[PDB]
Design a protein around this ligand. Sequence first.
Ligand code: HEM
Ligand code: HEM
Ligand code: NA
Ligand code: NA
Lengths: 713, 713
Amino acid sequence: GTSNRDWWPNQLDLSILHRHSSLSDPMGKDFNYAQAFEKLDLAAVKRDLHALMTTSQDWWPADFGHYGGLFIRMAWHSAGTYRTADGRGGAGEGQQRFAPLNSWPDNANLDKARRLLWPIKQKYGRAISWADLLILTGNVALESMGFKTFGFAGGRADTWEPEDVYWGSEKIWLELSGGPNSRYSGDRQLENPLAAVQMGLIYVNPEGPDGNPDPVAAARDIRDTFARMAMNDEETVALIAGGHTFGKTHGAGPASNVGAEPEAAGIEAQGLGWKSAYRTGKGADAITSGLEVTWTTTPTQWSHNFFENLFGYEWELTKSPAGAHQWVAKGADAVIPDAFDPSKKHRPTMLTTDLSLRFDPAYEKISRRFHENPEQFADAFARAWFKLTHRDMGPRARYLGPEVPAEVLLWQDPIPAVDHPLIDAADAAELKAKVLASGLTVSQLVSTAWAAASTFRGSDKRGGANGARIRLAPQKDWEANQPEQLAAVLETLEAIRTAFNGAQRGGKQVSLADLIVLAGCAGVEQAAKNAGHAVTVPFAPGRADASQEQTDVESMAVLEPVADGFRNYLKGKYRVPAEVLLVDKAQLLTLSAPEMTVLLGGLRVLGANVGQSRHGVFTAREQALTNDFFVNLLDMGTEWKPTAADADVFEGRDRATGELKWTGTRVDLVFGSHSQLRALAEVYGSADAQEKFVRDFVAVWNKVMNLDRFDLA
Amino acid sequence: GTSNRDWWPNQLDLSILHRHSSLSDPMGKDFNYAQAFEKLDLAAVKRDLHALMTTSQDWWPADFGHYGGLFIRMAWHSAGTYRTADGRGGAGEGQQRFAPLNSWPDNANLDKARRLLWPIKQKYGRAISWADLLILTGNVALESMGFKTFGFAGGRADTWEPEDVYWGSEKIWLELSGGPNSRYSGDRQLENPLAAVQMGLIYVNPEGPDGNPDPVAAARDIRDTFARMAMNDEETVALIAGGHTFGKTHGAGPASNVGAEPEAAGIEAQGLGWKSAYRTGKGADAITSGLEVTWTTTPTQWSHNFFENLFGYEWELTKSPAGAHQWVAKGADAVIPDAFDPSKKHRPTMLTTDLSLRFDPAYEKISRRFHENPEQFADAFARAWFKLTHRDMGPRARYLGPEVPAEVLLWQDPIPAVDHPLIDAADAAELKAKVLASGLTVSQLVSTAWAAASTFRGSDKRGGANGARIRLAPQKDWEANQPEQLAAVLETLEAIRTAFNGAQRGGKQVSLADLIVLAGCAGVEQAAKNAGHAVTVPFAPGRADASQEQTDVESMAVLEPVADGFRNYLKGKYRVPAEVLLVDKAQLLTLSAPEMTVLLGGLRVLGANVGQSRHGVFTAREQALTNDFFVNLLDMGTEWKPTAADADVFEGRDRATGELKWTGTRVDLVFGSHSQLRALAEVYGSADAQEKFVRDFVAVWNKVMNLDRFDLA
Ligand code: HEM
Ligand code: HEM
Ligand code: NA
Ligand code: NA
């Protein structure tokens, strides 16, 4: 059937804002996963997982009699889709079980691994999510094989439909770089927000870049992709050498033997894919990647044999039985065990990308250190494996169960514990009044609070107003935050804070993080008063102030809002139209289309625009909370045309006289163009809508202020 | 950005079951449109509409100084998308303002008409929906021009995103028949459920079939499409001649002057499209369809001139200024007024499809009768205009406001008013015990109540258990309803009914419609007891029994469930795969995917399959309400394969021994294959899920039993 996306392939897609409704969810409206998990007998689940590791099923026999290697790869790919640029991907939503991830070529035969876990999922039911179980299973694999993990946190709630993620523009799985939809340009520059080198890969091509088996060039792709997944050189070496201490690759015959990926397979396959016509299609005859490498002499036991082999041999370029490039140790004896035949042994083998850890000069120094000091290797790999598997879970307040590590890690963007009584309702009203008496304007108050709170993204649950990080590097210097204006507001608020805290008894105090939010609430209340409405904007205290020392400045960089349509801001010129970037930002903020619409219309008239731009400020009563943006936008007495200077800025002229009435951007005018957004704008632009507009604006402002308040979950 | 639909273009689309969530809706969850409408000053709206008619805007000037013709066309197209096959389309959801319909070529310049309405929509706000406004405006246009309408009902709630409708498979707007995606095969057979001859047309091509100007061949298409919109010959003739008593077509210059449709236009167009480079682009120079025809000597007044012209002249084939085929009266004087220039007059003109009303022999006889008896024409057009505009609104209980006609019409599928005391909870428990003591089985009671209730479709709000139409022709004879078994159950129920009604005092009685549903409920209670659960199924009395004379056998035919996955039934072999047909049926029933899943798993184990087919009956305790369907479907100890005799039936064998354990259809197996459905099946197939399954099954059973209960809304 032909669809709207076929007819108008470039129209903005709002359905990404309306995913994950209560319609698609099989659990009750009241189901609370954290409460279910808190009662799980986690020890009992782990003893079942342990037994599973060595209980081979004949429909996918276990290599070496042990599924450990398979399940470590399963959990590394569940986590390995993560991109720091947008926080999308990772293990936190269990998305490996849905399209497209369930059918990426890099995920071949992980369908088998997931199916092996159905009995345990079925036994424990809603008390352990698929998302948590994937990770836990990786942990238990490592434990069963003699590696002590750094810990585990539960709390990844299952999702029930595919996440909307940009994975690239290519129309061919694994397409080499340089095609009509190339993800590369310039001197091998990978486009943001991507974090893999080819469509359907986790990070890099195990043969080398675009198939070229040069370990030195492969190392450049590894470092770039890993950095785009928030991992540095030490973490990278530790993860790769750590993972490849276990198990094996599968390449026993030609890849043309392998049939359809799970989403294309016939109904009778019952959710599995990659059925192979090569000999038995499984076990000794398995074909997954097409490579056929077994790294260590004890693939089902933790050891330091990966680096002993890497450094102890010289390596020769060869081909697997499927024809893929790989490497074999020159002059070696047959010391590596066969996965099914106790009478056969094989020479050590390596991937091109393993050899990167020796042949890249910076990696070589880390790898030698780890080889010489295996205790350092084990500790780095444990900490890296934790980071890998938890990096998208958000603040530590979301971490559940008896195995959470006590050590606070910088990448967690830690927030200190609150150790004093909180302000009460009467205190909050006094603070709002003192903020308003200081001479701070509605515009300043709203803009500051918006800047602090709207760094949150629901993709990895980073950012938000908790921590008062807006006063720290780098946030205080971001152009979107208007650094000089910000410094003057913060100074005035910190004086209000000092005075209030100096007057208290009993240890009560207010954090700057809470006062920034509260002040923004006072602004919104005043703006409502300016329009004739008496409202109380809700406020929940309990945020704490983080220090510069607890703030990783480099990792914070990815939260910089280079496009923020809610402030009519675009840092530079991008290939993606500004309206698409607005809907992307709404998605990260967890906003529906109605919420996006209300919030944008309000922020325009409150004076939230960066630079005090007049674009979209369609009101003669700025700093009053009215529906004027929608009324004026929708007025057919105004005609709009792009300016000669800039086709992305529009002038709105009286249709009869020609007199200039307004100017707007694409972000402003999309609400009068897109047929679904225009239908929302019409609701708020109606004559009966001012009370509804105030209420819905206060609700969505409070939602935004609370996005990171997992302490109140 | 490449999406799952790009990778796997034939995968089943579940997002149709989760459209219209509370996420996309700008109204609060408690908003009740009928309550808002009931308070509207309808009189005031109509006065404003009357004023609008002659208040010409310079950006789309009114032909003849009166917009009535434009708004009549606007209302007729709002209604004219309706298909009796599935009940989808029509005016009832206001979908003309959304994609794709807002941009269909047949809707060209109706974006102007809708924008002319924005000031009235704005003024009255949520109290009148766009959906109602579009039809009311049509009505007012008719009244302003001298035509007395039969009535008007409000209550069409606005919707907030595009409806999921199959409009055809063609990839080119207006493609002529016989292309790679042809909607025609055989001897001009249009594929169901379509009701238009080309992609982007309302019904037929005004030049003639595929552009060939033959009025007698055009009449065949007119009769087929209009029948597929629930209109017969008399209604058809009355609507076409009635509509074309007013206004004009627009074809002043070549169509190459006209630019992009609304969904393709630049953001500065602010929701409008078809901007024209021909002269002033509007008014006297307007180009809409390309035809240039004005039918009557008084285009802004009701008259009998359509038929006087049609019969009074002989017609000659000519071309408009855009090159389109149309007809001109031989030897006539210049009697038809110009829309803008008082000094020009034109000869009478007609479309090919107008001439069909004279040159088709059955239409000719109706047209002559209307010509000779103008009162009869007036009454039939008033009735047909009401039907056109209300055919998708459902039962009379949904009709709101002071203009609703008192006359009950057959196409409304009328149900008599209840005129007696209803049964109470004590009576319901007595009746259920009598039903269970009769010897009727769980399978019989469930299957009958399912058959009665599952005729409902939310697309046009036809069908459901109200009316006890399952005892009448044609429902009693449908193969899916098992006529012999149905008759034996109805006989036993009607004996129970007679005995209970004979024992009452006052006028209390129970209808058969209620008893059918109540007996189904007793069967579900019994099945739950059979599984060891104590469950009371909710029941709401108040359904009444319709007569055969209130039940139009021909219009009931479209509700026949030729595919019903919930009974594992398929009447014949179809081009659409059975799982697609199940999701389509779930959509019509208003079910989400979790509801569809629970419902289907319960019906399988309760013995609801047509013919007592064993396909999908994955239980050894049939007639007990358990989650067996899910537990056995998801068991990896079974391997499935299509049978040699029939690739659409699958055998499930023990993986170790080869022994046959079950058989299933595509409808059964999709729940173990599609990755999102399998995730839902897993929830209900878990060890902790038996109580949840029972309770979610009762809820969705009750939902279905109440789909048509607008007497209780
Ligand atoms: C440059 C980065 C990496 C590359 C290119 C890569 C490549 C691969 C490939 C091609 C396979 C074989 C798939 C098959 O045929 O079965 C594989 C296996 C595996 N990888 Fe990696 N890998 C990388 C990093 C990782 C990391 C970070 C981990 C975990 C810490 C990991 C753990 C494993 C394990 C355990 C297996 C063995 C699976 C089994 O026994 O079935 N690898 N790797
Ligand atoms: C075979 C069925 C019909 C065909 C092929 C058809 C075709 C058309 C076409 C091609 C136009 C010109 C559009 C333009 O260029 O502006 C039009 C105009 C119109 N039609 Fe129809 N029509 C049909 C039935 C209907 C019915 C059932 C009604 C209403 C009861 C109706 C009422 C109108 C009116 C009022 C106009 C004039 C619009 C104006 O003044 O701007 N027609 N028709
Ligand atoms: Na994420
Ligand atoms: Na409909």
